[PDB]
Amino acid sequence: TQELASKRVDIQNKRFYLDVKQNAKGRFLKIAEVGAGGNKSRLTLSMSVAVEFRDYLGDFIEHYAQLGPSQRALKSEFLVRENRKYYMDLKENQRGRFLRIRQTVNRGPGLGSTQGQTIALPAQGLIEFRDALAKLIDDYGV
């Protein structure tokens, strides 16, 4: 398994890596939320699914940009493809708005296991994260 490319996105004090990889089966994207001394969690997406993810990020962006001042998710979506489900929830807590992304298996073994498969993006970073993703899709295609 070869690494084609790796981008890092720094959002407040969190860091995320988007890496494009290749194997015999084809091209894929790995998205890691980094912890203190390792990756906390990672998502795995095909390059095709990454395109759809990019588009959903667009919708989240638009939603966030329109909320106005803050005074149960603000917005919840999910995408299934290839026996993989991705839940996308825009939420707020005390520290601010964020976009949680959880990956699971649709069916077969795992059947709703989510461990080291949840990332949480501070919402401030959604544009930069979408742009990095979009750059990698422009670079490496499919």
Residue numbers in the entry: 58 to 128, 141 to 211
Which passages does the manuscript contain on this structure?
Mutations in the human PURA gene cause the neurodevelopmental PURA syndrome. Based on the crystal structures of PURA from Drosophila melanogaster (dmPURA), three conserved sequence regions termed PUR repeats I, II, and III were identified to fold into globular domains. Whereas PUR repeat I and II assemble into an N-terminal PUR domain via intramolecular interactions, two C-terminal PUR repeats III from different molecules interact with each other and thus mediate dimerization of PURA. All these PUR domains belong to the class of the PC4-like protein family, which mainly bind single-stranded nucleic acids and can unwind double-stranded DNA and RNA.
For a better understanding of the structural impact of genetic variations in the N-terminal PUR domain (hsPURA I–II), we determined its structure (fragments E57–E212) by X-ray crystallography. The N-terminal PUR domain resembles the previously published PURA structure from D. melanogaster (dmPURA I–II WT) with an average r.m.s.d. of 1.2 Å. However, in contrast to this invertebrate structure, we observed for hsPURA I–II that the four molecules within its asymmetric unit of the crystal lattice showed marked differences in its loop regions and in particular at the edges of the β-sheets. This suggested greater structural flexibility than average domain folds and most likely than its D. melanogaster ortholog. Already the different molecules of wild-type hsPURA I–II in the crystal unit cell revealed considerable conformational freedom, not only for narrow movements of the loops but also in the folding of the β-strands. For instance, in some of the molecules in the asymmetric unit of the wild-type hsPURA I–II crystal, β4 and β8 strands formed bulges. From all the areas of the structure, the β-ridge appears to be structurally the most divergent part. Determination of the crystal structure of hsPURA I–II revealed larger flexible regions than the previously reported invertebrate structures, with considerable differences in the four molecules of hsPURA I–II in the asymmetric unit of the crystals. These observations provide clear evidence that in particular strands β4 and β8 of the N-terminal PUR domain are dynamic and can adopt considerable local differences within the β-sheet.
